[PDB]
Amino acid sequence: TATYLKSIMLPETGPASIPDDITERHILKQETSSYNLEVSESGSGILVCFPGAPGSRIGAHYRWNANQTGLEFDQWLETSQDLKKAFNYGRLISRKYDIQSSTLPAGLYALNGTLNAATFEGSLSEVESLTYNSLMSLTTNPQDKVNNQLVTKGVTVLNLPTGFDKPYVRLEDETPQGLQSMNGAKMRCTAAIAPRRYEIDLPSQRLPPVPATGTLTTLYEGNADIVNSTTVTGDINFGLARQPADETTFHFQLDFMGLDNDVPVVTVVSSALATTDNHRGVSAKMTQSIPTENITKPITRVKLSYKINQQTAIDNVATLGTMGPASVSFSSGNGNVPGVLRPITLVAYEKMTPLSILTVAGVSNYELIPNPELLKNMVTRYGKYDPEGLNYAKMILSHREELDIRTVWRTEEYKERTRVFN
Amino acid sequence: TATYLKSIMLPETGPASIPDDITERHILKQETSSYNLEVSESGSGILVCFPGAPGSRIGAHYRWNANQTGLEFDQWLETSQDLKKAFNYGRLISRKYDIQSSTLPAGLYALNGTLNAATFEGSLSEVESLTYNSLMSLTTNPQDKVNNQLVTKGVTVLNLPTGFDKPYVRLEDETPQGLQSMNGAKMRCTAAIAPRRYEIDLPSQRLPPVPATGTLTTLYEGNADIVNSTTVTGDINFGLARQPADETTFHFQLDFMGLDNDVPVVTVVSSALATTDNHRGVSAKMTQSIPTENITKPITRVKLSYKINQQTAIDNVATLGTMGPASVSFSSGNGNVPGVLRPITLVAYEKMTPLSILTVAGVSNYELIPNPELLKNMVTRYGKYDPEGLNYAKMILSHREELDIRTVWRTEEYKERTRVFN
Amino acid sequence: TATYLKSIMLPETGPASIPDDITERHILKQETSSYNLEVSESGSGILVCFPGAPGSRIGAHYRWNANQTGLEFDQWLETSQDLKKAFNYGRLISRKYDIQSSTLPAGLYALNGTLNAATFEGSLSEVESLTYNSLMSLTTNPQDKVNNQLVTKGVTVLNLPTGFDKPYVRLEDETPQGLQSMNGAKMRCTAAIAPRRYEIDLPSQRLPPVPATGTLTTLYEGNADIVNSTTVTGDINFGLARQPADETTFHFQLDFMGLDNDVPVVTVVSSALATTDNHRGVSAKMTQSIPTENITKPITRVKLSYKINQQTAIDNVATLGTMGPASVSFSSGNGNVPGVLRPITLVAYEKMTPLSILTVAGVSNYELIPNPELLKNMVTRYGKYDPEGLNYAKMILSHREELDIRTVWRTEEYKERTRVFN
């Protein structure tokens, strides 16, 4: 009794099964993350955490350049064992990040730095600026913010459950194959359990004119979100005013960008040869698939754009929508499952001593189903049946105000407030 | 009981409605700033505090250059949430500043300290000279000055009210627009409730002769401060001595400059084509309006110039004021509201280690009125009716000397002196 | 004792002097007005109440067109006597509206028609939907709304004061003159006590190209709010990309439009003739002042547009801002006095019998300052000094919820829930 609640407050005490209605034959597997991060010249950076993602990517790390004019993606914060190689399905039970610096290099005198932390129901694209002080303008819950904590005392980032009946999402595992493939090919069983769909919804107006051939005029530039595989569906139909004297190609790019810099994480291309025959029903169809191994860093922006390859076609207005409602969409994995992409927790350290080390210790419990290769030797079973235990997590997630149960803590406060949970 | 007063002395325990005779329906907000300012080469600098301003800019920061002769504007000190996006009207309640180093020494004997602070009573532009020594010669009040404080002990700039019936100031919000707008044309509803007018008032004598065509000789150069949208009204009228041989343009400038250096924060222009038929009634109407988003850094230095564009009309006298006073004006915002543009609080650190860090942690409480959007879901209501209320605030301010109620503290004293107000 | 509060709850009981800090010599007044509105074929219409406007114009009346695609302006609602003929300065104390049918059925089954009313805490320009069901979402307060009231029983719009120390406002009286004017001229002292300023702030990119000579391309258009006199101070300065082959005129319009249809309530034109010399910088200044008598119906939208008069100038890119910010602002009356333009009160009747009658029964109470010709015969005195006076009204406005004091009532509930007020 009370064993699952203990695992939420004390993630680093071993995993206990989730006493909910989704009941499979599984195994409990506590994983850990260990990171010593080198602050850049500025020493400021920003640490994006996904305390609910049930996979192996628990966050990201971004650095400000010399001044704070821009950010740079350092690397993903992954967990030790790559779970996609030994497992198929996974349900995150609990997690706990932990940030601190607390020490200086060989010979140095000044230790300076502090942290800002804020839990945020959102998708890292609902954010407008991640500067050290704009983080406090992300929530008004006094239980989701921690401001001005010295890196000497650090921040605990607990995870609180966003619902109790999440599914066993797939882990993007690889599948068998025969000795006939292309040597540069594989097939994964990606996630699709609860997708997330975006629609660009171009209007039925004229195409904006191009300055010259091949200069890639812009059509839409907004904030999206992608962390894993994605399927693009849609077509950009248009009709030329007059028929072209020379065949034109009408490139359409739609590239993706992360929050830091304007280098396409993944770029796509669709073409549409406008000839005299179809010169009212020219259509370019976005039907591509983007595997999650092309997602090197998180994506937050999308820029749809186009260029034309014929000088004689800078005129020839080419209005939209002649064959239908001229839209482009992309659905992506299990976006809307309420652990992935939402809610983010942000931890920004500020002007730490250059050449110092920020230490991150993550501990993420799990409920996993082994893959075929592991099933032969592993013994999977059901949960241990506490009839209550899900009530406690409810009647405590309801009193997080008067019981003061946070999602970001000051580590000293957390080390001694959670002792009543043994 | 006594809940407004405690919010003034302890502007971190939360907000509290002003028990004055301005009783609109409002929202009780509290807002934090958190800045970690890096000390430059010289290490001296100076940070300005507007402890009454009801907007989002609650301060500024300057850095003394190498030989400590000029300054350099670093950045504004704004609150976390840009209030001009969710609210329309707002009045300040309390405000607090903390200033420390937060740098930790690897061992005994902390680094270079030296913090000064004094609460001016005029506007920033009126300060004769702001150096580390020249701050105690700024008021005669023993409670408005703190001198020779170690930058690790810290000062605490408080806000003591300068009036109790202040109008809800319009927060320069954005208004809904239409699809045919230009590309980025945005109309705002600026602040106008009690402007602050300046009158250039140049006399009816000769214009100072120009050395060579296009040289911008000076007419007036003075000291006026501006923080938000301003509107320039006036006309420079003058009459020439004879018929000009070829037509001249008479370019006038009226540019605005900040405290630190001589790059114009914003400029305007009014030309006046002097010609044969009006060689007695040339006039240059000044009608421009300056948005607040052109006011990048604080403006505290004006300069009015002019120049000719024709070689032959240099020995043409062109006496001024032949059709009236020949003066230029620029009213601005609501500069005469008590709390805006005065009282200023200057805090100067100096000879601080170029490897040290300055931390500013502001706290602000407001009464605000939501915009129509936030007004559908938020519940605005009236104050909580403390009858006595403001009388306590008045008795305390009157006896502030025999109670030693300061506007700038030694942070070690603000903690133990201001806890009588539990 | 408690005489002032009673004047707000029960305005149909005579005025009482406001026991606030503003204390001048005045005459109390009770003014009435009665309107029998004709319900058009749509039967729906909309009633805009300014429950706090201290002048003599106390509302407007818009009726939906036949197919309810839009609405149209019928007439101002205003007090019986034109106050600006006998008095100079005025100050509202109380106001009550009564909306009812005044058409009665010969027998059972009371007539068609239903009535929504909500108190919006904004200006009229800040309402996007004026339809019947999309105005229960203008507030969340259960005391500022009433839905689905039978038009035969009606609603009582009752003014609650948004602030107390409100100044006397100039009532736009006409000044004496001499028999030397031009048979139409007249000067009047307008309201300027607390302006409301809007600024259009064009950005410094290219001017949008004109389709043809004199075709009035559009720069900006959004929701402004204007009810009385207005000063227009601005400057639009651009620069052509080369010498124009012939003189161009560059018309600018800036038309103000009612919320109903796109006919200009008033328009104010500037024009800048660009020639060979000033082509690099040429400005069109806005210096218009709109007398309050050109505001026939309320103004809710503005529109900055321009056109050119030369065929050769559809080229000549003509970028903006070469001589400063290129902004046009307009400051209007005492817009930011709480009571003018805010709060508003909307009352929509739905589907009354076409050609039926609807009656508004307004009663105002003023503190007035007469014009000279009435000083010589009318004693002016001070308020009669109730000390408590305002504290009682404040306590009532604070316990507004648990005491259920409403802005809009069901007339039958107001009629008996304000009886304890004697």
UniProtKB/TrEMBL annotation, chains A, B, C:
Keywords: Capsid protein, Host cytoplasm, Hydrolase, Metal-binding, Protease, Serine protease, Virion. GO terms for molecular function: metal ion binding; serine-type peptidase activity; structural molecule activity. The keyword Protease applies. It is found in: Virion. GO terms for cellular component: host cell cytoplasm; viral capsid. GO terms for biological process: proteolysis. Structural peptide 2 is a small peptide derived from pre-VP2 C-terminus. It is not essential for the virus viability, but viral growth is affected when missing. This is Structural polyprotein. The chain holds residues 7 to 428 of 933 of the full protein.
